[PDB]
């Protein structure tokens, strides 16, 4: 869940 939170915050797939 802490991981889910940081993914929601930060996860990006660059073009």
């Amino acid at each position, epitope marked *: *869940d*802490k*991981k889910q*939170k*940081v*993914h929601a*915050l*930060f*996860y*990006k*797939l*660059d*073009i």
Partner: antibody
Amino acid sequence: EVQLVQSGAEVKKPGESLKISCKGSGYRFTSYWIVWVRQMPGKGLEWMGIIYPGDFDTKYSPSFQGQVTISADKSISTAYLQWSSLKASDTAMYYCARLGGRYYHDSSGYYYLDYWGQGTLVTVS
Amino acid sequence: NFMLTQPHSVSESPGKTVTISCTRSSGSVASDYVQWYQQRPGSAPTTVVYEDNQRPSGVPDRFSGSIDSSSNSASLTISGLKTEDEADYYCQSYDNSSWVFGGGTKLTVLG
């Protein structure tokens, strides 16, 4: 070699505008978030905001929203922090930092500030 | 919304171990990841712990982070103290997308 290099010290007067910069080199600039952090003299760190240069996704601390603008220019690998009307209370050291890590949407992914700019002192008097 | 409270200062002689606490004022500390930063006087900060207890590459294993749910705190342990460890240390977590920093702790390595 990954490097974040900020612009030089600024001496301004209240009411003036200002744009300071954080240039990234040694890596794909558009692939990593840039954080800005403020530090008033003799005081602690304050988070200002964050920008993802790839799609310009930007978040601000509630205490800096509407006070400052964070931006980015892909072509020159540079993040910016800017004010429309400086106040004496903007006197501080400003740091940028790259959010590095493993950008995978699974449990191996992680994010942390792995490189820091050297800081830019802004003195407004 | 919450704050992170740290002792104003800690100290020990070289070779000893020091612990710096970071207490979350409201909400459980285990609800959001805690990072730690070292800032030597006059220099940019560097990250010494992320995600509660992960050590970045390049950081000596003398630095170790942990969480203590029973005291709603995070802690940074600095073991085998060296003179170069003298610095301010900041904890940091997240409040609904916003980053929250503790007030900082001055570590003095007694000379």
